[PDB]
RNA sequence: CGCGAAGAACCUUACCUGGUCUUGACAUCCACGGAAGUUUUCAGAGAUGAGAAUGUGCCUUCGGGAACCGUGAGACAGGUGCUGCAUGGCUGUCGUCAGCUCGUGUUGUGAAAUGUUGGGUUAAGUCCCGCAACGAGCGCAACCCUUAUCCUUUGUUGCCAGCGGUCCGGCCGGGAACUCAAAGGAGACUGCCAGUGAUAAACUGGAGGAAGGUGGGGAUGACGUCAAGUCAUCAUGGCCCUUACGACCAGGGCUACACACGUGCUACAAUGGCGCAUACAAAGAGAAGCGACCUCGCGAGAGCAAGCGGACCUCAUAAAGUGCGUCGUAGUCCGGAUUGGAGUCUGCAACUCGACUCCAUGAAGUCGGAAUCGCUAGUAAUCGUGGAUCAGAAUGCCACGGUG
């Protein structure tokens, strides 16, 4: 088969050390790996009133960036499966993997 | 924001989850276009008012979780714009830095 | 308007006109249900409709059918400016 | 004029976040509330334990809370029984299972939260505010801080007209984004009202 | 304009003819950013100026433009609450700019059907020194000669 | 071989392949008169190819994405000029004087808070 | 003065009329009796008052302890009640204006002065000289984000130059070139060349370059001023209420209407209106959600139902524009207010008081007195698109591109 792995996080340093962890766990265990590719980063904006009572035109603008990385895996061995299910990832990376 | 106004809100969502999203059957199934369009649909329209004046998610004012403010709400955070800003500058909301594009 | 699949009336008003249907003319029926539509079944009754502070008596005629009860009880008093 | 919050302007440049979890939109507001209730609890329980910073991280369905404190033997308790009845009540609040870690603050007089609550404690002890400000400024500058300024506000010494008085030593460049500024805030509830304290501590650039 | 005295932006020539003064004329005619609408009006007006009333098309356009260009205008000068009207010579950049602006505004307030035929009448009025775009030129020239003493 | 250029204007992006010899210009598998109805857009895509003289000497295969009419036509002209300077490299210094080598960096200004537009302010009254 | 309010039919809601409760709607502690939940019963506008069914978790270290309910007596709860002229926090404003100060020295009996003034220069208390000053701090600038050029890496859900094939759609084989995506790196410093300048700092001009002198835009707001704004976000000193200024419910109100003002939208047309045909975007949102195809309806919509937690699916066929035809300067084939009739959808519920659709109606208005506002370039002007709030409900607000 191919197994597809999506990574999303709020930081880009933390997300591509996490991809570097899973591209090098996967041909250390001996599989061709496809990627990693950066998908477009979805940025969500917010705009608040800062004053407790009036003054409409005084505002702040904030943002959350969600970075995305995609790795496809070519050669899903038995050794490859038990390697990258038991890996030491950080608290900021969300993983959702595809069969 | 007036302890009773929050208790009115806490009671409203707890009583809304009590009936609706479970027994929305009274209008989503019987008030349909087929052979139930006889008296059984009409008794369904009558039966919908036996349930309390609450129960409906259209009476949720959806206030802030800390202060209980009814205005300036943000559904992403659950907090008012005063408390979103006060906690974002403290670094409490993850990934929320000041936007400048 | 409301759609064609069912006019609205409250049940406490629907039962109260039903017992004025058979048992005859009464005192004017006190109601708070301004949002109910006037059925064929109510011609001849007097419905005292609430308007915020009082109950205004409404003697039902045949042209009032299909209107709301709140239309025959003005909630705001006003007469000239100066 | 009004200033920008010096911790908020430096997020992602020199200062990190105090929460390091990921969520989608469904789980975002409930993680934010449970972070609020865990922080509210640990502030009230460890009030005499000099806690500077509470870093909440959430892996998959976990939570781990790192308590930076100047005085770690009292949050630990007698060989570790106090942190259990901290984590038997944090996992109560968060719902997920919990872990408690404790990080030692080496110099508590270069920490803007610990300096602000030291001034706040003295103002409620009926101490004149000049002594509380000047001792806090001298103690931080003699330990190698590159600058400090403190500032108190509101009905000083029981006066009936409020004042804002501040005292600076060293170098505090609030417009420089490379500047490692440690800023925090505390409030003192006295018999004449609320006195607000603000502390800025500069430790060098980049 | 106290401190930073600027250069100027360079514009394209007209596509059909290679004219930069017609490119200025289409710009002055243009309303709310509609350049394609305004080139069709000028090209319609320049044709019915050329073919009905003597050829040599943009040769005819400057014959109409020569007859509306002013040579001396008036400008205020404030001294003490009595501010004089002093005649000043017009720059040739401003000469074309004032002539094309007076022709467009003359052609706007006519009663004919299209805009191109209002423009065509105004260019044929100006080529023969009549109309109202010419009379704006001598009204400026009358006022300049009236205040000739203040040179 | 194909000689290539990339040009862009406001939000448009054009790739340009030039091939040695004839006068066929085809754009998004349509030719010039079918794509650009406006004569001004036809001229500015022609413009780099009359300082360099090409009667029918270069086939041009061009595609373009994004923007509008004048954005795409300026993105083509900037893409042609880069392809011709790849083509012989002696063309640069007269193409500099024509201003065609300059990437026009004029972008739309963002809307600002408190303002009705990028710079338009609401109507002020003293009282 | 389209301000709090990023969205009042009920709710919100703090106001009014009426119906009701008094350790309470919300919290801790005590005693007693009931495990919680279930689901129907008649009155009442509803809050509130009257039967059946049932649980029994858990160790009992077997008295019961732990969750949830009812009743009783108190400490107490509760207050969007008053004071922003008792406060904290936050915000406006002069003003992104170039300023505001201190140490030590010196001068003056002293308040104070000097530095910070002077000659030049700069966007800048910016820099260079001179000088009883020598230094330093908060500001300025830079460090941050975005936009404009190139290089490297990776290549799907994005791309199609060279190839094969094709149902002629990158759709298949395939390719890693290109567009693009997002990580890393390079680039602009008055660096270079003339000239002017006090052998200065700096100015004008030129080359190269994608970009030239702060490249464009944003974030960033010094000491202070106005007893400026907010006790109704929250917090808080004092005062006041405590069978009510607290609490629950139904209906009404915040939408009234002789008038005056502020901010907008649409017009008064031919650079246009209508009809048919046909091009070219960006940035977003989506699971009690976005909802295609097909069928029905003139239409708003309805039925059925795929796909999509998303460079994949959907919202979602951009409009100005261009081509052809018609109207021919009129209160009009301009304008679409008002009112009548018939509907759709959301919602317990559209009477007061929703949005939208169809048919009919077709006011004022023909460019606006005195006066007054915004804008220096991708700006103004004009044309559409998206989001937050939100069941439904933008001419407002916040964003995005086209023409220019
Ligand atoms: K204040
Ligand atoms: K001194
Ligand atoms: K108070
Ligand atoms: K109402
Ligand atoms: K409006
Ligand atoms: K107006
Ligand atoms: K309504
Ligand atoms: K009409
Ligand atoms: K809505
Ligand atoms: Mg609501
Ligand atoms: Mg625009
Ligand atoms: Mg406004
Ligand atoms: Mg105003
Ligand atoms: Mg109400
Ligand atoms: Mg000064
Ligand atoms: Mg001086
Ligand atoms: Mg300086
Ligand atoms: Mg000096
Ligand atoms: Mg700066
Ligand atoms: Mg490559
Ligand atoms: Mg005041
Ligand atoms: Mg009510
Ligand atoms: Mg109102
Ligand atoms: Mg559709
Ligand atoms: Mg007319
Ligand atoms: Mg300007
Ligand atoms: Mg229009
Ligand atoms: Mg909009």
XYZ file of N, CA, C and O (backbone and C1' of nucleotides) in Angstrom, chain C residues 1-5 8 10 12 15-16 30 32-35 50-54 68-71 75-76 78 81-82, chain G residues 16-18 43 45-46 250-258 342-355:
319
model
N -45.349 35.635 5.848
C -46.292 34.920 6.649
C -45.782 33.535 7.218
O -44.642 33.130 6.832
N -46.556 32.872 8.066
C -46.297 31.469 8.340
C -46.657 30.651 7.111
O -47.551 31.017 6.345
N -45.958 29.538 6.923
C -46.159 28.728 5.734
C -47.484 27.971 5.813
O -48.180 27.985 6.831
N -47.844 27.318 4.705
C -49.202 26.802 4.552
C -49.457 25.515 5.317
O -50.602 25.049 5.337
N -48.444 24.931 5.948
C -48.609 23.636 6.607
C -48.823 23.839 8.110
O -48.011 23.461 8.958
N -51.079 28.476 13.522
C -50.668 28.337 14.905
C -51.759 28.815 15.851
O -52.352 29.874 15.647
N -52.283 28.380 20.398
C -51.951 27.714 21.641
C -53.025 26.705 22.013
O -54.160 26.753 21.533
N -53.988 25.991 25.318
C -54.829 26.472 26.401
C -55.910 27.401 25.876
O -57.003 27.468 26.440
N -58.442 24.840 23.964
C -59.357 24.132 24.847
C -60.362 25.082 25.480
O -61.503 24.693 25.747
N -59.957 26.327 25.732
C -60.840 27.262 26.418
C -61.944 27.759 25.502
O -63.039 28.085 25.971
N -60.164 35.726 29.313
C -58.861 36.343 29.529
C -57.781 35.495 28.880
O -57.676 34.296 29.152
N -53.491 35.677 27.261
C -52.238 36.350 26.986
C -51.683 35.979 25.625
O -50.582 36.415 25.283
N -52.429 35.204 24.839
C -51.939 34.605 23.602
C -52.254 35.532 22.433
O -53.243 35.380 21.715
N -51.373 36.505 22.228
C -51.556 37.434 21.128
C -51.137 36.842 19.796
O -51.498 37.385 18.750
N -50.399 35.739 19.814
C -49.811 35.153 18.621
C -50.686 34.089 17.974
O -50.251 33.455 17.011
N -54.676 40.448 26.226
C -53.712 41.247 26.970
C -52.925 42.138 26.020
O -52.652 41.764 24.879
N -52.575 43.336 26.487
C -51.792 44.254 25.668
C -50.621 44.859 26.434
O -50.075 45.879 26.011
N -50.222 44.251 27.543
C -49.147 44.788 28.345
C -49.571 45.143 29.753
O -48.836 44.877 30.705
N -50.747 45.748 29.907
C -51.215 46.095 31.241
C -52.678 45.737 31.489
O -53.068 45.500 32.637
N -53.497 45.693 30.440
C -54.929 45.451 30.574
C -55.338 44.291 29.678
O -54.517 43.703 28.976
N -54.432 37.598 13.581
C -53.957 37.301 14.921
C -54.801 38.046 15.944
O -55.427 39.062 15.646
N -54.817 37.515 17.166
C -55.565 38.163 18.235
C -54.881 39.442 18.691
O -55.544 40.381 19.143
N -53.556 39.500 18.574
C -52.820 40.689 18.955
C -53.062 41.896 18.075
O -52.741 43.012 18.494
N -53.625 41.703 16.879
C -53.906 42.820 15.986
C -55.042 43.700 16.477
O -55.151 44.846 16.035
N -50.783 48.002 21.674
C -49.927 47.959 22.851
C -49.305 49.301 23.205
O -48.697 49.413 24.271
N -49.422 50.306 22.347
C -48.818 51.605 22.589
C -49.905 52.659 22.534
O -50.646 52.742 21.552
N -50.912 56.637 22.399
C -50.329 57.841 21.817
C -51.459 58.685 21.258
O -52.266 58.177 20.476
N -48.756 65.129 19.645
C -47.523 65.556 20.291
C -47.731 66.778 21.173
O -47.408 66.749 22.362
N -48.266 67.853 20.610
C -48.442 69.087 21.356
C -49.799 69.715 21.067
O -50.596 69.933 21.976
P -39.361 49.317 36.251
O -40.702 49.264 35.402
C -41.338 50.453 34.967
C -42.529 50.152 34.094
C -43.612 49.288 34.712
O -44.483 50.023 35.547
C -43.140 48.526 32.524
P -45.111 49.343 36.852
O -46.276 48.420 36.288
C -47.426 48.979 35.673
C -48.302 47.903 35.088
C -48.669 46.764 36.025
O -49.722 47.070 36.920
C -47.950 45.872 33.966
P -49.667 46.516 38.426
O -49.880 44.942 38.278
C -51.176 44.411 38.056
C -51.148 43.011 37.491
C -50.748 41.893 38.434
O -51.771 41.515 39.334
C -49.670 41.590 36.365
P -57.788 19.640 32.907
O -57.957 20.493 34.240
C -57.902 21.908 34.207
C -57.381 22.481 35.499
C -56.656 23.807 35.390
O -57.536 24.904 35.237
C -55.454 22.364 36.817
P -54.957 30.328 32.398
O -53.546 30.115 31.693
C -53.415 30.114 30.280
C -52.086 30.688 29.852
C -50.860 30.097 30.538
O -50.355 28.947 29.887
C -50.808 32.451 30.734
P -50.236 27.560 30.685
O -48.828 27.647 31.420
C -47.618 27.652 30.675
C -46.585 28.540 31.313
C -46.016 28.051 32.631
O -44.973 27.108 32.463
C -46.672 30.306 32.852
P -41.837 32.760 30.405
O -43.254 33.434 30.143
C -44.404 32.650 29.858
C -45.656 33.487 29.890
C -45.702 34.643 28.908
O -46.079 34.255 27.603
C -46.348 35.408 31.041
P -45.371 34.931 26.334
O -45.965 36.406 26.307
C -47.302 36.644 25.908
C -47.776 38.019 26.311
C -47.018 39.204 25.745
O -47.315 39.497 24.393
C -47.357 39.550 28.034
P -46.176 40.117 23.446
O -45.988 41.604 23.977
C -46.995 42.580 23.775
C -46.781 43.802 24.633
C -45.617 44.703 24.263
O -45.908 45.565 23.180
C -45.597 44.335 26.580
P -44.788 45.950 22.101
O -43.734 46.814 22.916
C -44.040 48.126 23.358
C -42.983 48.632 24.301
C -41.613 48.855 23.698
O -41.513 50.051 22.957
C -41.383 47.702 25.733
P -40.842 50.015 21.506
O -39.291 50.148 21.813
C -38.810 51.235 22.579
C -37.472 50.947 23.213
C -36.312 50.697 22.270
O -35.777 51.902 21.755
C -36.275 49.128 24.045
P -35.222 51.986 20.255
O -36.333 51.257 19.383
C -37.564 51.902 19.084
C -38.026 51.598 17.688
C -39.520 51.766 17.463
O -39.749 52.273 16.151
C -38.889 49.575 16.906
P -40.316 53.759 15.948
O -41.441 53.902 17.064
C -42.732 53.324 16.899
C -43.709 53.922 17.867
C -44.137 55.335 17.493
O -45.544 55.390 17.279
C -43.422 55.202 19.795
P -46.094 55.784 15.827
O -45.655 57.300 15.649
C -46.239 58.330 16.435
C -45.650 59.691 16.146
C -45.180 59.942 14.717
O -45.444 61.303 14.380
C -43.389 60.295 16.213
P -46.854 61.746 13.746
O -46.890 63.314 13.981
C -45.746 64.094 13.702
C -46.021 65.565 13.826
C -44.915 66.458 13.290
O -45.012 66.688 11.900
C -45.421 67.104 15.497
P -54.451 37.216 0.033
O -53.413 36.342 -0.794
C -53.841 35.551 -1.888
C -52.670 35.007 -2.658
C -51.746 34.082 -1.894
O -52.269 32.778 -1.737
C -50.469 35.610 -3.159
P -51.822 31.892 -0.479
O -50.380 31.366 -0.889
C -49.271 31.487 -0.015
C -47.979 31.431 -0.786
C -46.775 30.882 -0.045
O -46.740 29.468 -0.034
C -46.175 32.880 -1.136
P -46.223 28.685 1.264
O -44.642 28.830 1.196
C -43.904 28.284 0.114
C -42.462 28.720 0.161
C -41.698 28.353 1.419
O -41.229 27.021 1.407
C -41.287 30.616 0.873
P -41.270 26.162 2.753
O -40.094 26.776 3.628
C -38.746 26.576 3.245
C -37.811 27.540 3.928
C -37.690 27.422 5.434
O -36.881 26.333 5.839
C -37.841 29.700 4.823
P -37.206 25.543 7.197
O -36.542 26.435 8.330
C -35.173 26.806 8.269
C -34.869 27.895 9.261
C -35.405 27.673 10.663
O -34.575 26.821 11.432
C -35.842 29.899 9.970
P -35.200 25.596 12.257
O -35.943 26.293 13.478
C -35.214 27.021 14.451
C -36.102 27.973 15.210
C -37.317 27.365 15.878
O -37.027 26.693 17.085
C -37.960 29.316 14.740
P -37.539 25.188 17.282
O -39.086 25.349 17.614
C -39.485 26.047 18.776
C -40.944 25.864 19.104
C -41.915 26.732 18.312
O -42.349 26.107 17.112
C -42.314 27.001 20.634
P -42.650 26.956 15.780
O -43.322 28.297 16.297
C -44.727 28.476 16.286
C -45.112 29.798 16.902
C -44.941 31.013 16.003
O -46.094 31.259 15.221
C -43.901 31.412 18.103
P -45.963 31.561 13.654
O -45.013 32.828 13.599
C -45.029 33.697 12.478
C -44.913 35.132 12.909
C -45.140 36.156 11.813
O -45.750 37.317 12.370
C -42.885 36.279 12.590
P -47.351 37.404 12.447
O -47.651 38.933 12.751
C -48.804 39.556 12.213
C -49.366 40.581 13.158
C -48.377 41.583 13.719
O -48.088 42.631 12.814
C -49.805 40.799 15.441
P -46.605 43.229 12.720
O -46.441 44.060 14.065
C -47.192 45.241 14.286
C -47.139 45.669 15.729
C -45.759 46.003 16.273
O -45.368 47.327 15.966
C -46.916 44.587 17.795
P -43.876 47.655 15.477
O -43.486 46.431 14.550
C -42.308 46.468 13.753
C -41.602 45.136 13.717
C -42.405 43.959 13.165
O -41.523 43.092 12.457
C -41.678 43.465 15.347
P -41.390 43.167 10.860
O -40.124 42.257 10.546
C -38.940 42.378 11.316
C -37.917 41.334 10.946
C -37.605 41.197 9.471
O -36.699 42.185 9.023
C -37.869 39.053 10.440
P -36.916 42.909 7.610
O -36.207 41.939 6.571
C -34.814 41.688 6.635
C -34.460 40.368 5.998
C -34.871 40.188 4.547
O -33.980 40.791 3.629
C -35.520 38.291 5.771
